[PDB]
Amino acid sequence: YYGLKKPPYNLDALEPYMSQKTLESHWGVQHRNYLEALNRHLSRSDTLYGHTMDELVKVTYNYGNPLPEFNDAAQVWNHDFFWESMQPGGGESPTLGLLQQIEKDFGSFPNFKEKFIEAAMTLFGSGWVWLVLKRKEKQLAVVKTSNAVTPILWDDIPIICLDLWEHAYYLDYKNDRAEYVNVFMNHLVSWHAATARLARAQAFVNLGEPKIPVA
Amino acid sequence: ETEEEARKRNWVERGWAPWEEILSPEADFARKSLNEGEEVALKNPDTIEAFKMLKPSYRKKKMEEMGLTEDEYYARQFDIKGEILDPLETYWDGPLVVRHVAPRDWPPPGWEVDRKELEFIREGHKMMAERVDMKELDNVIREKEGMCMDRYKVFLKQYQEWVEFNKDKLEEESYEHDQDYHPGRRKRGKDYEEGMYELPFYYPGQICLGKVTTLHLYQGAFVDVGGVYEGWVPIKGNDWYWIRQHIKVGMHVMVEILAKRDPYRFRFPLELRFVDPNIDHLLFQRFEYPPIFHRDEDTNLDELRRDCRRPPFPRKDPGVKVEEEPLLSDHPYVDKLWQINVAEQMILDDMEANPDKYKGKKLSELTDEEEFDEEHSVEYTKVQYKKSLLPKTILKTSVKELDLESAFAERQLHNRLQKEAEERGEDYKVDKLRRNIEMDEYDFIHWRRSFEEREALLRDISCRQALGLPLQEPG
Amino acid sequence: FLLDEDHYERRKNYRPQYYSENYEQSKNRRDYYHYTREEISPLWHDGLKFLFVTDGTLRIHYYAPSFDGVVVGTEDVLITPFTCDRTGSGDAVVAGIMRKLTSHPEMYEDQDVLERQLRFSIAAGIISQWTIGAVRGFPTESATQNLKEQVYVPSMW
Amino acid sequence: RIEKPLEELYKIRVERKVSPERLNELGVSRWTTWKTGKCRLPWDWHVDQLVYIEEGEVRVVPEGSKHYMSFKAGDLVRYPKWFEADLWFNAFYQERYSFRAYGD
Structure with a gap:
């Protein structure tokens, strides 16, 4: 039934940047409502109860034709990722491991920051922005998705996700995404979480060179 | 290029790997004596040894002077040659605090269980969300008993009855579908030891331990987890050139389930990754799609793909938009109305224009003349146009x-x-009879269907372009 | 036919789904199955002294009260494709078996002598297929011995 | 072993024996009618179609299949996008269809 996964910090941890009421509404009401709808939908079907969360997301989204299940499940997964993609008083420069990959694939941290801001600004409507790995090419890339679409659906491992829905930044920032995205990239991202996710993704994607024998 | 990148090309692309060859002493001498020349005196060291080793009595002298007795001098030629890697070391990431919850895919489809019992069981799944700190982990109760596992106990009772009932059925089916035994198949026959876990006992997320009982060059390592179906860690190609120096037969390892699959369709139903040891830094070639079974019972190749969730067979792009196109106006029933209408006039004009042919014209209740059956119509008749015989x-x-x-x-x-x-000479206005009005009416009905189908595409195309969903189905 | 036609026809036409077993199974040669003494048991009784199963002239399986085995032979009718007629070869095989049984009375309890003397019958059966007519071309003893010595290695004969 | 019904394989969601409360919320009354007799209609749906067969049968066969599904009065078939079926009609058949795009 996938009970609520608590964020790794209290609802007032990010008060100077994300208001306590914003955390109470985003997680207490919205995420809980999505999960409750998913629970009601899971009660009926029994072939969807035997599916993992990733399998449920990947199956209820058909090959382009979502069932009356994709929205709620994908929203629940995306919000889990979003909550786990922060840390109190975090941000700033990255740490070892991730920095070399970003520099190799993007060029420098400021380059990544500019590309992330630009790709967040070029979204219309409600959606999410992502920094994900890419299989079959092994390269970090900034990607964009609309509504409740996730980069998982085409064999991409998400590493960082940012909510661009208007229901996130309206209690304190009203009608501008510049302040919201700048605050997220400055004092809200969790390079520890991104590093952990990249380390886990290293199991399924090999970012390295083989040890060829001299022979 | 030079032999540092050109050699690299063979490994990464063409799968080259310097697998060691176990040459017999007669074949060993050939490789170490053809470098010098056609027929020359053999003065090269390590070549005289090959020539001198052709005598078995000299091999006995060589081994006894080194020792190792017999049955070990034979086994020392199979050793890996080259860069012998330093041995594995497996760290961890903290305590292995675990829950005990029933697998989600319970009960199996077809099995019947009181839903109230499961509604109590399913609360265990909903509890796999709270996290645990090192605080409250120092408060280990440490009393060896009094474990509050209750929902798992209910699942065990239900699972235990399931095993004792359907075991005879399941073994019979495995004898029916699959002919021979391969790792990943049902452990049937003499190899079935009572007490093995069944497939429903497993689920992704669980961390297991087992022994490595089979290494396959093209499939990977098959670890006996403890069930009727073995595990499968996908390792293929030349990755085994380094991995084989870490994983050996009989090793006890700790694994985690990534995904369990249907044994009927997918070849290896259990997929695992090595949690102890960790060889994630050595794996480079990975399976894009899990292996499956192509059985004779699968008559349609477009149902097989939906079973395994594979991309369909691509078709060459026609190039047309399929958005602006002539609307269909034909109706399937009209092609039978033409046959019905013709038969009416073929019998009518042979009944009223010539009434004496069939004495009385009782068409209000007329019965059939010849016996008729629905499933035969081969009417082509070789109709001649004074030129040749062409079907009509x-x-x-x-x-x-x-x-x-x-x-x-x-x-x-x-x-x-x-x-x-x-x-009087008034114009005879007869153009459409009862049947020919139905022809235009039914063509009108089919027009309405084709009208709205093209009408709904206008809204559908716009919606799938404002968001990003595909227009043409993938492949 | 006397034991089970369907079972012994399904067993003959069988190839493994994955991998062979020894190596000979990986060559798809002909099936020369040597029936075990527990399969021919329903056709066995106390008074029996010998059971012979002939797969043409190719092989002869012999079963005795205390031992059993198979004698290996060959055939060739394409050596003379225009004057080949298999009719009457089984009679020659049986006649050679009887002749060697009566000539050598020690074949009953000596497996080596039994195997050595059972190749004469195979040679006779091979010769009998090289001519048209059952009684026209039954082989002579000297011709049978000549073919036995020409086909079989000196160690066997 | 039960093979997965061809009904669900293509993700066709059928509601056999529809209750009357369901229909009024869905408004099947204002749906364009379609009818036929002994027929065989091959179609290549580009849009989702909600059907309310009123009398008859369909014996739908997907393209290339050697099996068939079957339907009758009181169904709510949901033939999906990009489907390629081979509807084989026998006797009279009536229906109400309400082609639907992304949403609702």
């Missing part, structure tokens, strides 16, 4: 499907008008 159409339209009463009254009404119009 004269098909069977037995009166069972024929409604003569409607046309019987109508033709007399039309025949009255033509005989009364010879005098």
